[PDB]
Design a protein around this ligand. Structure first.
Ligand code: MG
Ligand code: MG
Ligand code: MG
Ligand code: MG
Ligand code: MG
Ligand code: MG
Ligand code: MG
Ligand code: MG
Ligand code: MG
Ligand code: MG
Ligand code: MG
Ligand code: MG
Ligand code: MG
Ligand code: MG
Ligand code: MG
Ligand code: MG
Ligand code: MG
Ligand code: MG
Ligand code: MG
Ligand code: MG
Ligand code: MG
Ligand code: MG
Ligand code: MG
Ligand code: MG
Ligand code: MG
Ligand code: MG
Ligand code: MG
Ligand code: MG
Ligand code: ZN
Lengths: 97, 202, 129, 87, 217, 96, 96, 25, 121
RNA sequence: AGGGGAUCGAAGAUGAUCAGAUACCGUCGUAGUCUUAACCAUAAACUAUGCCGACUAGGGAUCGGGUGGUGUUUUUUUAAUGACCCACUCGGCACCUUACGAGAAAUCAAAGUCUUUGGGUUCUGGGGGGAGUAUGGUCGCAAGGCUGAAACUUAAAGGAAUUG
């Protein structure tokens, strides 16, 4: 029996999309099926900034973010925290957090 | 059938306009509503409150027809119209339901529950859908305070009012209260404002 | 493509009645839908209809009452000999007492009781009950 | 349904939806009969007279219960120009 | 004593309602059953089947018993009850009460020439349940009930004499074919024949005529 | 049958169990019950009386336990309610 | 539209497609191909005499265990050799 | 009995039948 | 460890509805009140109804607790009805006698009735 | 067959892991991966849903094109375009709600308008195996593709869902 109306995932109206490679796994996966997530974070973890505050010349220096977009195959995405099995009726939802 | 005692008096009119009972919803409005008058900028439709009043009269006339007016349930769960539903109840017979509907009321004949009305009025048909679903199991007519976006499903007479506002819900209940007794007893003098105040229903 | 205008017409009618509507517009109309509608009016499954003279093929608005169960076409238009009307009525019609399978004969388009008493037949058009 | 020698045979005889001339069958528990109290001089409820209206459960659930009630009611009086036969 | 609830249920022992056909006319929900015990008290009953069903449980094999039972006079009322319970006879008894609260009116008729005393069906009619279409077809007299024996018996209990039947689907699953036969005769009083075309006054409810006979003192 | 003689006699509840075979191959497990059976805590001593006797049927012996739940209210000795029970009253129609 | 043509003039394609599709019916296919003539140890007849070549024992399929007691026969009309069960208790002893 | 490979085998071991019916000339 | 069950919570509020006449914020007073009007079996049983009834009382002052009625909750909770009546009824007052309405909201008026305080936007 | 051959990498070579491990993992690495000129014709080539036509519910977005407005910015002074806004509409990718209808159910706006069975048409299926085998024909350089049985054997295989 058909589990999702999106079949695998989110492609209606083309026929063929193109493959991307899981960042953790290297497995081929169509772009529309990959599990995508942005690692928008500063180059500093918790604390370590006011341990660097007076460490810096340049009174006025902003904080540069480190940007990187990540694609997961289904299997990796499930095995990490990325997505989780959801109930039958819970699988129809597109709320991120 | 239709006398001019029940015409919309301009002093009655200023009651409705102060509440904004004539403001319909935005780009949302069920196809089953020609109760609309041509709409404003900023998206909001103006109800044709003449159609309100005529439906409200018929509402009243259907209620008065109920032989023993004790069994006429009137429902709110909506945070607002709870206060006004209880006031409406004591005036006529009018068994009330405020708070949560507790499903099993019209089916499921067990006590500490289970009115068996012959009519039912609802503040919000959307938010009181358990009663309107349940009523359609038991041959019970439904009267509803439909707004422009409100489901007409299983509702039998729609009162087009503005259900998304404080005073607008209370007004109709009191006007429906005033009308159902202007049909037998208290407030015999039509065109004579009822002793009672509308601001009580809030 | 449009192959039976009659079939498309009675489909709109049957779909109209089934949703509790009281009327339906039906493009594009013809000699033979009307006569069909007419034999349906004589026995009273609809009321007024108006032909609408557009200058191509004609819309039609028919007013329906609620007594209709089904009006359908039989396609293709089988040649039915007089003795075979008893066969079709048995299949298509809910009971002996009422309902009508309607034919087109050289004596015109008519229901089957008229056809039986006037005593002719020809091809078959449809049915109504 | 009478018979030969005219003596009627059918037990019971259903109502009919007012908006669809349909039939209301025994289990049609979405159907509802309406009573509008007919008024006279000063309303007075004319206790126990009514004008009567039946809606098939189907008409109720499709949403046309409300609007087919307005056309039904107004064409019988009961209502000013609230309904419009032309849309 | 019976001691009803249900504004209907009190109104029927008050004798203000005398025929079941007045409940049907107003299509009134019927939530008690002593009402129909009297309204028509000639109700026969055959249990059509008792059949084990199981629910697997950490120990295995619940095995409750299920009984399907049907009730009617041979005079145009049938009801059908499907109920299961732990002990065999407990399912039958509850099966009878629900067989009661279901009773439906069926519209008999003549095959051809309308003589006196109907024997057969108003029209062709069909009900379905699961895979099981069941078609009921008007028949000439002296033909009997040509049907499988579980339906021959139900149709006996709705007082029909001459009918043709034509099944389809998985009829070996008997619980369903009955359900479908029941939807079938249940549909006899839905078919708008020409001799029902006339407009009628809308008889006023017995919940309003004898409206005074609810509540308490 | 001899289950319900015990219930209209005025008991709060009653179980009858039988083990063995008359539908007779392997292992009866048949229960017959009604009412109420606090089982268990201390009220079992106070309010349930049980006795098992062994009936030797034709081709085996069958065990009938019976449990009876006397009405604790009319105990005529010791406690006259379960320690679950509570009760209260109010004043009559009074002066304002 | 239901898969097949309906026109008053499509008798050919209708008749010729039943002919095509009757072939997926085992009972039809076995008849038209005459495999009771070509195959089929008996001539397509109901019975056949034969000369008993030897008694013979065959173990049954499982769950069962037993020896079924067949004979081996050479059909007089055919040469073809076949095995045949001999019914009922004992009764193999009647076959020399 | 993965079909993909019940079917590789079915070919592996059917060209063999073809290539051995040609020895028999 | 210390979660009181419905035997106490039902019985403990079974009283407060019939005896808010009296009843105190002190435990040992209700302790010896309980067995006068109740039929508790054990002391620990009664001391736990009392400990909770007192607990409901030590909090009854500040807002009623869901599921209560004691002849005075009904009285005083009614007193806050009609806060605004005996002042402006929301007609031509809090307004300048005029009803402030918009261009199309207004056209709806000339349809049937005419007596109107006007405005535009 | 010529070009091209950075990368990845069937074979292969190796380091591990392993009871074994010419598997999974690690390092290599041939053909291949790209390309011109020829072949091949198949994929879970999938919406596992033929195409044409008609009709039957509620709702909000979006892509294209058009229509309308003293409408916002473009301020170039206002225009006029483009962008945007609101409203309509034809056409398209989809989606939400719901079934009134359908279905074995999962579900379905078609999978509806069917035992109340007929708008037109093309292809395919008839229990499971044996078998897409044998044979003939045909296409291919080949790998293989297209067409395609029978003996024989079997009481189930299977689909959807339920409880554990
Ligand atoms: Mg799966
Ligand atoms: Mg495309
Ligand atoms: Mg593809
Ligand atoms: Mg990036
Ligand atoms: Mg076990
Ligand atoms: Mg304990
Ligand atoms: Mg074939
Ligand atoms: Mg052949
Ligand atoms: Mg084949
Ligand atoms: Mg090369
Ligand atoms: Mg290379
Ligand atoms: Mg590498
Ligand atoms: Mg290797
Ligand atoms: Mg490797
Ligand atoms: Mg190459
Ligand atoms: Mg080619
Ligand atoms: Mg293929
Ligand atoms: Mg395919
Ligand atoms: Mg198809
Ligand atoms: Mg189409
Ligand atoms: Mg739509
Ligand atoms: Mg556009
Ligand atoms: Mg423009
Ligand atoms: Mg412009
Ligand atoms: Mg096969
Ligand atoms: Mg070949
Ligand atoms: Mg077997
Ligand atoms: Mg399965
Ligand atoms: Zn991965």
């Amino acid at each position: 029996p058909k589990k999702r109306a999106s079949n695998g995932r989110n492609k209606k109206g083309r026929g063929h999309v193109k493959p991307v490679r899981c960042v953790n796994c290297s497995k081929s996966i169509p772009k529309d099926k990959a599990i995508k997530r942005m690692a928008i974070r500063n180059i500093v973890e918790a604390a370590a900034v006011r341990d660097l505050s007076e460490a810096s010349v340049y009174p006025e220096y902003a904080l540069p973010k480190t940007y990187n977009k990540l694609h997961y195959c289904v299997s990796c995405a499930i095995h990490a925290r990325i997505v989780r099995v959801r109930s039958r009726e819970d699988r129809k939802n597109r709320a991120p957090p | 059938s239709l006398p001019a005692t029940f015409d919309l008096t301009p002093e009655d009119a200023q009651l409705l306009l102060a509440a904004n009972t004539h403001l319909g919803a935005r780009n949302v409005q069920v196809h089953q509503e020609p109760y609309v008058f041509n709409a404003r900028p900023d998206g909001v439709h103006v109800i044709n409150v003449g159609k309100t009043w005529e439906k409200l009269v018929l509402a009243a006339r259907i209620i008065a027809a109920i032989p023993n007016p004790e069994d006429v349930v009137a429902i709110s769960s909506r945070t607002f119209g709870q206060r006004a539903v209880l006031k409406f109840a004591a005036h006529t017979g009018a068994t009330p339901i405020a708070g949560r509907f507790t499903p099993g009321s019209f089916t499921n004949y067990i006590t500490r529950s289970f009115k068996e009305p012959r009519l039912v009025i609802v503040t919000d048909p959307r938010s009181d859908a358990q009663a309107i679903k349940e009523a359609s199991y038991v041959n019970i007519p439904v009267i509803a305070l439909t707004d422009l976006d409100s489901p007409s499903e299983f509702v039998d007479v729609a009162i087009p009012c503005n259900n998304r506002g404080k005073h607008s819900i209370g007004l109709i209940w009191y006007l429906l209260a005033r009308e159902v007794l202007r049909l037998r007893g208290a407030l015999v003098d039509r065109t004579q404002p009822w002793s009672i105040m509308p601001d009580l229903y809030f | 493509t449009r192959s039976s205008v009659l079939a498309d017409a009675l489909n709109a009618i049957n779909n109209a009645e089934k949703t509790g509507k009281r009327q339906v517009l039906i493009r594009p109309s013809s000699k033979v839908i009307i006569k069909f509608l007419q034999v349906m009016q004589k026995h009273g499954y609809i009321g007024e209809f108006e032909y609408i003279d557009d200058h191509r093929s004609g819309k039609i608005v028919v007013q329906l009452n609620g007594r209709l169960n089904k009006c359908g076409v039989i396609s293709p238009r089988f040649n039915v000999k007089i003795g075979d009307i008893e066969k079709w009525t048995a299949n298509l019609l809910p009971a002996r007492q009422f309902g009508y399978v309607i034919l087109t004969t050289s004596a015109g388009i008519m229901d089957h009781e008229e056809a039986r008493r006037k005593h002719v037949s020809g091809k078959i058009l449809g049915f109504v009950y | 349904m009478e018979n030969d020698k005219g003596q009627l045979v059918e037990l019971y005889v259903p109502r009919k939806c007012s908006a669809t001339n349909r039939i209301i069958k025994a289990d049609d528990h979405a159907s509802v009969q309406i009573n509008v109290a007919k008024v006279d001089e000063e309303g007075r409820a004319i206790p126990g007279e009514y004008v009567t209206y039946a809606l098939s459960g189907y008409v109720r659930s499709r949403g046309e219960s409300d609007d087919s009630l307005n056309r039904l009611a107004q064409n019988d009086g009961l209502l000013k120009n609230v309904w419009s036969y032309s849309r | 004593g019976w001691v009803p609830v249900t504004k209907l249920g009190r109104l029927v022992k008050a004798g203000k309602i005398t025929t079941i056909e007045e409940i049907f006319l107003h299509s009134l929900p019927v939530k008690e059953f002593q009402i129909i015990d009297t309204l028509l008290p000639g109700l026969q009953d055959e249990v059509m089947n008792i059949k084990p069903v199981q629910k697997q449980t950490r120990a295995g094999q619940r095995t409750r018993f299920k009984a399907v039972v049907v009730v009617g006079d041979s005079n145009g009322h049938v009801g059908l009850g499907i109920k299961t319970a732990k002990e065999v006879a407990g399912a039958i008894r509850a099966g009878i009460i629900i067989a009661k609260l279901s009773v439906i009116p069926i519209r008999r008729g003549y095959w051809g020439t309308n003589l006196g005393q109907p024997h057969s069906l108003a029209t062709k009619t069909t009900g379905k349940c699961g895979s099981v279409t069941v078609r009921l077809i008007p028949a000439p007299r002296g033909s009997g009930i040509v049907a499988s024996p579980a339906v021959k018996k139900l149709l006996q209990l709705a007082g029909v004499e001459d009918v043709y039947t034509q099944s389809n689907g998985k009829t070996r699953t008997l619980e369903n074919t009955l359900k479908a036969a029941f939807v079938a005769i249940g549909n006899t009083y839905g078919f708008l024949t020409p001799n029902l075309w006339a407009e009628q006054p809308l008889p006023v409810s017995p919940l309003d005529i004898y409206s005074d006979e609810a509540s308490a003192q | 049958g001899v289950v319900r003689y015990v219930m209209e006699s005025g008991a709060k509840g009653c179980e009858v169990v039988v083990s063995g075979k008359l539908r007779a191959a392997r292992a009866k497990a048949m229960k017959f019950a009604d009412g109420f059976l606090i089982h268990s805590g201390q009220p079992v001593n106070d309010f349930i009386d049980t006795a098992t006797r062994h009936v030797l049927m034709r081709q085996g012996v069958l065990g009938i336990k019976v449990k009876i739940m006397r009405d604790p209210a009319k105990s005529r000795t010791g406690p006259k309610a379960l320690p679950d029970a509570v009760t209260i009253i109010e004043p009559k129609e009074e002066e304002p | 539209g239901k898969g097949k043509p309906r026109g008053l003039n499509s008798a050919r394609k209708l008749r010729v497609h039943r002919r095509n599709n009757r072939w997926a019916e085992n009972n039809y296919k076995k008849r038209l191909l005459g495999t009771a003539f070509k195959s089929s140890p008996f001539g397509g007849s109901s019975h056949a005499k034969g000369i008993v070549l030897e008694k013979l024992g065959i173990e049954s399929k499982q769950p069962n265990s037993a020896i079924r007691k067949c004979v081996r026969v050479q059909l007089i009309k055919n040469g073809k050799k076949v095995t045949a069960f001999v019914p009922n208790d004992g009764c193999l002893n009647f076959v020399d | 009995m993965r079909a993909k490979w019940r079917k590789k085998r079915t070919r592996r071991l059917k060209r063999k039948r073809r290539k051995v019916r040609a020895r028999s000339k | 460890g210390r979660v009181r069950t419905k035997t106490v919570k039902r019985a403990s509020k079974a009283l407060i509805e019939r005896y808010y006449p009296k009843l105190t914020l002190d435990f040992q007073t209700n302790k010896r009140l309980c067995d006068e009007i109740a039929t508790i079996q054990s002391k620990r049983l009664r001391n736990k109804i009392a400990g909770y009834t007192t607990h409901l009382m030590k909090r009854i002052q500040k807002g009623p607790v869901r599921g209560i009625s004691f002849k005075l909750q009904e009285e005083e909770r009614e007193r806050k009805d009609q806060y605004v009546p005996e002042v402006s009824a929301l007609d031509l007052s809090r307004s300048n006698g005029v009803l402030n309405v918009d261009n199309q909201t207004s056209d709806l008026v000339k349809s049937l009735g005419l007596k109107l305080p006007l405005s535009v936007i």
